[PDB]
Every structure is written in C-alpha cells, then in structure tokens.
C-alpha cells in the first residue's frame, strides 16, 4: 500500500552483515573466555594435587571418599548408626542442620530410609525434619510445584503416624513461604492429600472415575476453614497434575501417590443371607471401613453393619447370581464373622455369617466394589489419620 | 587414636612435573586472553566500519566512573581483589593507611566484606586494621557511645579469632583515647562484651528474663583489674543500651550484637551420692565448663565442684527417680571422676563417683540440662577466649 514506515515483510527486520560478523566475533570471544575458565579450573586442580593432603601413596579412591562411601552404606542399613558413624569420624557435623543438608543432598542414600528416619518421633529427628523442609524453597511455587520438589527428596514411610509428621512439616513450611494463601496449615495439609488422591485418580488405570477440573473444584468445597479456595487456584493445581504425574524416586510402582484410592462407595448389591441363604437387594454404603446395608434408600437405620477389619475378598462362581464375591476371615475358618443386624421385630442382634456372599449388578460394579473394599481395608490407619485431621479442618459454626 | 586438626609439616613439594604443567596451562590461558583481545579489536574495527561519523555521537561515556564502579563491584565479591584493582587503576594508594581510609569511607562497600578483610591475620591487614581504628575518634565518649560508632563502620565477622583481633584493636584505641577510665585493655574488652551481651538480653525476645540496672552493675563486679567500676558509669551504659539498641548497618536480624547469648545455668536438682547412695536436693550452677553444686542458693562455698573436661552425659533409667541423666568418663570406663567436695567436718576431699546421676523435676528440665551440659563440653572458642581474659584481669601481679 502507498504509505510510509511499513516493512510488510517477515516477522524480523533487515540485518546488516557487519553486525552479524560482530555478533559472531562476540560469541567466539565468549567461547575463548569459557576455555580460559576451564584452563584455570584445571590449574587449580593441579595445584591441589601438588599440595600435601594426608593419605597414603597408593590409593584407588581417596580417604575422604572411601570413608564417606562406607558411611552412606551404613546409613542405608541403619540411619541412626550411619549418622553416628559420620559424626564420630568427622565426615559430618553434629547439628540437625548439617544432618539435614546431608539427607537433602542424599548422595548414595536410599530415599525410603531417608523417609523412615525423618518420620521418627525422636527430638533430634524432629529437628532434622524441620531443617530438611527448610532446605526446600517453597516461596512463589504453587502447592503442586512444592509437592513435586518435596516428594523427590525422600519416599513416604508406611506408618500413618510418620506420614503425618512429614506432611505436617511440609504444610507448615509451605504456608510460611506463602502466607495468606491458605487459612490454616490444616487446609494446606488436607488439600495436599486431595492432590495426591487426584494423582492416583488421573494416572492409575485401576481408577475409572477420572474427575474433571469442575469436579475437583466441587470436591474441595469448604476446605479453607469453611470457606472456598479460589477456582483459578484449584484449576492450576488440577491441570498441573493432569499434565504431569508426580515423579517418584526409586519408584517401585507401589507408592502412595500412585495407589491412594477412594475407600468409599455406595450402591445396590444383592447379598446372600447368613443361616438362611436367601438373596436380598440392599442399598450399601462403604464408609469408616464398614459396609452398612439398608432395605430402602430412605431408611434412617441400617439393616446391618459389617466391619471390614481382618476380612479379605475371594471371587466365587454362584449357581444363580452373577458377579459374586465373598467376604471372609482367613484367620478364623468356619467361625461366625463379627457383625450386627436388625431382626423383623427391631431387635439388634449378632450376625450368623461365616461368609458374606455378595452379587454385583455388572462385572464393572463388582470390580469397583472389590477395589473400594480392598483399599479401605489395606490403608485404614492412614484413612483414619486423614479423617481425624479433616474433622479439625471442619469448623463449628 | 585421634589425630590433630591442624597438622605440622616439613617443607617438601615434589610436584615439579605438575608445576611445569600448571605453568604451561597459564601460558595457554595468556594466549587465549591475547586472542580475545584481538577479537575485541576486530569487533571495534567492524563497529567503526558500520558507523558513519556525520558528527560524533553524544552519549556520555565515563571511563573513570566506570573504573570506580568496577573497583567497588570487585571489592564486594573479593576485598583483596577489589583493592588490587583500584591500586592498579590509580584510584587508591597502596599503603595500609590509604587502604584504611578507603574502607573507613566505605562508599558503596559491603560492611560485612569490610569486616572480613579487617579481621584477617595477614601482616598488611593487621596494619590496615590499626589504621582503621585510628580513624575513629573515641575521646570524650563513653564505652557504649564508642561502640555505637565503631559498629557502624563494619559488620563483625563470624570467626572468634577475627572478632578478637578487631575488639582488641578497638579496646586498645578506646583506652588510648580515654586514659584512666579502665585499668587495662582487658577490662575494656570484657566490658565491651558485657555491653554486647546486654544488648542481646534486653532486645532479643528469645531472652525471657531482662536484666535490671542493678543486675548489670553487680554482674560486672571485679572487672576493673579486681576492683569495681563506678556505679554511675555502669548505670549510664545500661540506660543507653536499654533506650536504644545498637544500630547495625545492613542489619539482617542475625548480627552478633543481637545474638550474643549467655549459656550459663542454675537450678535445683536431685543428685545421687557416691559411696553412700543417698539422694540430695542441691543448687547447681554451670559455668566455664564446670558444674558446681551448693546446699543453698546464697552459699559462696560449694558442696562440690565437677570439672566437665573429658566427661560425657547420657540419659539413664533409674528404678525410683524420674528424668535422670548421668555424667561419666567415656574414655576411662569405670574410672572415678576427678572432683572435689566438702565433708561434714569441713574438710575438702576428692569425690568418689564413677558416675554423677542427677534427677530433674520434669522431662523438659532433664532435656534442658542435658543440652546445656553437652554444649558446655563441646565448648565455644569465643566464650573460652573471654573466660581467659577474665582470669587475667587481676589485682596484683
Ligand atoms: O428374609 P429371609 O428370607 O427370612 O432371610 C433373611 C435375610 O436374608 C437376612 O438379610 P437382611 O438382614 O439383609 O434382610 C439375613 O440376615 P443378614 O443381614 O444377617 O444376612 C437372614 O440371615 P439369618 O438371620 O442368619 O438367617 C435371613 O434369615
Ligand atoms: O548426706 P549423706 O546421706 O550422708 O550422704 C552423702 C551425700 O549423698 C553427699 O552429697 P552432698 O555432698 O551433695 O551432700 C555425697 O557426696 P557427693 O557430693 O560427693 O555426692 C556423699 O558421698 P560419699 O562421700 O561418696 O559417700 C554421701 O555420703
């Protein structure tokens, strides 16, 4: 167009050849500088070699390296003994901060053992855990970003009490680094486990219900001490996890972050009677590691309650009913399972079941129920830990 | 056995080949630098070719200001290297007095870096330090006022030997400026640290019990080479610090003047006897790596004295008493601990203890005493240096 000041060319303007040459020269100079730096480093190394360092003349590895290597192996066998060895032999200073730096570096250390050690209730270990989380720089990171760093540094212990200590230290550190984001440490803690469950949900194929961004927003309603967190904040967390699962060190495929299942379920099932083997359709609620069943969805009181403590599942083929499994106690063959139910007259009595045979409406519902029940049983101490924590999260109005 | 931290050596340097290699590397580096310079020249030529001088460009370039700024930048990263750059660029003269004036003005200089440089043991640095203190006028100022002035000029280094050199230089200067105020340099030095400790005690919220003027006065009994300083002088110093904490430049909230804590302890505990296994309530005082115990808080004469050198402490189970710990000699198992105590007849005799078992009224107090005793045993180099000066402050030679 007849105008002025308009290139109407490419996205870039015209370059001049001399300028390009100058740029190339600058690059060359930079390379030369780098080379010089490398040479200087080499010279320094040579000087160190020249210098008298105490050791013996023939040596495959050196004194410091050899001693630290054995100390790391000692740590992996028994963290308390390893730390002690390193301190005694002046390979590591005695303060919680120095020990924490050693653990954070984590060179040649088993990260499961790191987790076992940091999760101990001893006063020294508690102080190391504090310094350990202080080595994680959480300022200006969203909660997932901080979790990614933290969960690279160690492997979560199996003991519910130990998991609690470490996630409490994490949540407290996050909130101090990011003040005003969450109303309480409890909020941060519970949301953290919501993120961990979402990781399992979205990335483990054994989980069929893949929550949407909107669904995850709804699930965390009232988490902020009764209030709701910003929808944008929850979306960023959801999308980060969706895009990339938690990367776990020394991953055995058995990690909590990958196998944190929802232990709760509701729905219709048929159940076979105890002494009298009649099939009845009942509304079932799995909650608090118990299977509650009701005659009608509108009933206030359950028809019966089956504690899942000490039970396991076996699939069975039934002559009449499809998609069957049994709950049974593998330790007490032929013995009645501890449970309660209501008779026709309203009397609450003990159940007469050696086994509970259950039939699901579809193969898919069978698999869902067995997963939920197994999950509920297998991680009960941990779900209990979260439940007692969530109660203090809810506020009383 | 144990090996000494600093080792002695005989001058030997069999690394002729290595040295030669280093020299070769240096030569290569020099060549690289020359090449870089050539490249820069070429770039300049290219720039000239690019530019057409219709006139000359008016952008103020100032080589002298650039060198000044460069020198400061260098100093703040490495004080020795910044000072050498300024000298080579004719912006600073090379005498200790000239370097001292440069640091004393400290224009755009990091005050922590100034302290790092002044504290060094080098012959040149020692001379700079003396000239640096000479540029401070302490005449007609009291010790707090002189300390306010001095502590504006630099930040105290962390190392005990460096602090000592700087505070010795200060105390010497103060006493020359104000003759007759203190009977010795030692008196001035120790009182300076009493003032610093007071600043910490009054102004650091971590110190619970704030000293009164009268506590500060009595704490300093005998400091003037065996005699007391004027009551009103000590009161004036106390009142000045109480009214205004030391103002520290570039303060990070972790300055020595704010964190100079008193580790000495006192309290009632129950102790088990030696030959005769009776439990006695005794008033304990821990100071200068020794545990004293008394019948009454008002006694000057202790019931016993237990030097902590060569001892260790461990928590112990007792059949009857809770919250117990034990002093024992880790290196000589079963050996009687060197101590003295008084008998009912007034004799002083050696103790008969292989261990000193002591019961605290709470688990918390047991933990506190153990921590304090362990800290005493591990020692603190600067606490010890102050202790030494306090011992030399003496009435008669
Ligand atoms: O209703 P009828 O055909 O008489 O049979 C009943 C139902 O199957 C009960 O199920 P529900 O309680 O769900 O109604 C069952 O109790 P369980 O709940 O213990 O299975 C009874 O077991 P016994 O009481 O053990 O015979 C059985 O007698
Ligand atoms: O008071 P009685 O019951 O006679 O028993 C005394 C006290 O326990 C003493 O403690 P204290 O000195 O605090 O009064 C102790 O001295 P230690 O202070 O050395 O423990 C004596 O130890 P032996 O002297 O070793 O028996 C012990 O005989």
Residue numbers in the entry:
A (entry chain B), B (entry chain A): 3 to 399
Q: What does the published report state?
A:
All cytohesins share a common architecture comprised of a heptad repeat coiled coil (CC) domain, the Sec7 domain, and a pleckstrin-homology (PH) domain. The PH domain binds phosphatidyl inositol 3,4,5-trisphosphate (PIP3) and/or phosphatidyl inositol 4,5-bisphosphate (PIP2) (Chardin et al., 1996, Kavran et al., 1998, Klarlund et al., 1997), with affinities, specificities and spatiotemporal distributions dependent on splice variation in the phosphoinositide-binding pocket (Cronin et al., 2004, Klarlund et al., 2000, Ratcliffe et al., 2018).
To explore this possibility, the 2D class averages were systematically compared with 3D volume projections over the range of possible views for each model in the MultiFoXS pools. For two class sets corresponding to compact or intermediate best scoring models, 3D volumes could be built and refined. Automated docking of the MultiFoXS pools with the refined 3D volumes selected best scoring models having relatively compact conformations similar to the more compact models in the six-state MultiFoXS ensembles. The low resolution of ∼53 Å for the refined 3D volumes likely reflects conformational heterogeneity in addition to negative staining. Flexibility in the CC-Sec7 linker is the main source of conformational variability, with a secondary contribution from hinge conformers that does not appear to be strongly influenced by dimerization.
